[PDB]
UniProtKB/Swiss-Prot annotation, chain B:
Component of the CST complex, composed of TEN1/C17orf106, CTC1/C17orf68 and STN1; in the complex interacts directly with STN1. Interacts with ACD and POT1. It is linked to Cerebroretinal microangiopathy with calcifications and cysts 1: An autosomal recessive pleiomorphic disorder characterized primarily by intracranial calcifications, leukodystrophy, and brain cysts, resulting in spasticity, ataxia, dystonia, seizures, and cognitive decline. Patients also have retinal telangiectasia and exudates (Coats disease) as well as extraneurologic manifestations, including osteopenia with poor bone healing and a high risk of gastrointestinal bleeding and portal hypertension caused by vasculature ectasias in the stomach, small intestine, and liver. This is CST complex subunit CTC1. Belongs to the CTC1 family. It is found in: Nucleus; Chromosome, Telomere. It comes from the Eukaryota. It comes from Homo sapiens. Component of the CST complex proposed to act as a specialized replication factor promoting DNA replication under conditions of replication stress or natural replication barriers such as the telomere duplex. The CST complex binds single-stranded DNA with high affinity in a sequence-independent manner, while isolated subunits bind DNA with low affinity by themselves. Initially the CST complex has been proposed to protect telomeres from DNA degradation. However, the CST complex has been shown to be involved in several aspects of telomere replication. The chain holds residues 739 to 930 of 1217 of the full protein.
């Protein structure tokens, strides 16, 4: 299936915010012996990875590379919008 | 050099107004030849490089709308720029004092600067033609473990290549660990 950049971004953001369970990150009994400041600092950050090819059906990314002259951030741009992106070549060789 | 907010200096012969803080950066590199002219599809034989006592080192200030080229600069890669139009002499050696010559506070006094122009563009050369220079594309320089772990406190320049284990943000000062 061919998605649009805005739809992909919104779906990713919604899925990321959906499964944000603090109890999962810090299970028992480690939190049982923690102060408030350390607990809050530990819970302050997280991350998540998603593979679109694992969804039903598969998805393919398509876009136009655009290098804006304001922030120096290469983006994939379409009519719907834009998106931050990172480009690398083979075997740890920079683009 | 990294990309951040930078302050230029007083232009030569212009109004004495404080340069505004604008995002910009600069690079340092070494030349490989003299002035070169286009010839057909390719470029003509470049003029011989002057046997000058000055070190073959140049500094290029990138600012304005040229910041978009930041992501395509990496050490050890052969880069050739191009100035569209006629090959005006004295264009790839030093900044023209008469024209816009604004440098940051850390680069104003340098004797080797070359501010890029908007109409100029940059391209990557071919591997086979300049394979001789590309032979020095080994691992990036890095100080020894003893140098990084010796006590001293002289010097604050180190380099290595590591693998991230864990990341954690610090808040009360803004710091990421």
């Amino acid at each position: 299936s061919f998605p649009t950049l805005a739809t992909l971004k919104e779906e990713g953001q919604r899925k990321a915010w959906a499964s944000f369970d603090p109890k999962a990150l810090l299970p028992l009994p480690e939190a049982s012996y923690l102060p408030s400041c350390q607990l809050n600092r530990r819970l302050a950050w997280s991350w998540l990875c998603l593979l679109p090819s694992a969804f039903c059906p598969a998805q393919v990314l398509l876009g136009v590379l655009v290098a804006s002259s304001h922030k120096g951030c290469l983006q994939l741009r379409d009519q719907s919008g834009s998106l931050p992106c990172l480009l690398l070549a083979k075997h740890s060789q920079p683009l | 050099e990294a990309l951040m907010k930078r302050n230029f200096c007083v232009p030569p012969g212009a109004s004495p107004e404080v340069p505004k803080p604008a995002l910009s950066f600069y690079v340092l590199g070494s030349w490989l030849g003299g002035t070169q002219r286009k010839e057909g599809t390719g470029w003509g034989l470049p003029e011989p490089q002057g046997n000058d006592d000055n070190d073959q080192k140049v500094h290029l200030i990138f600012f304005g709308s040229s910041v978009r080229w930041f992501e395509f600069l990496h050490p050890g890669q052969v880069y050739r720029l191009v100035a569209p139009g006629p090959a005006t002499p004295m264009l790839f050696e030093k900044d023209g004092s008469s024209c816009i010559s604004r440098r940051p506070l850390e680069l104003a006094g340098c004797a080797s600067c070359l501010t890029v122009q908007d109409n100029w563009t940059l391209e990557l050369e071919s591997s086979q033609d300049i394979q001789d220079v590309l032979d020095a594309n080994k691992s990036l320089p890095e100080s020894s473990l003893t140098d990084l772990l010796s006590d001293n406190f002289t010097d604050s320049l180190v380099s290595f290549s590591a693998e991230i284990l864990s990341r954690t943000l610090c808040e009360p000062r803004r710091c990421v660990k």
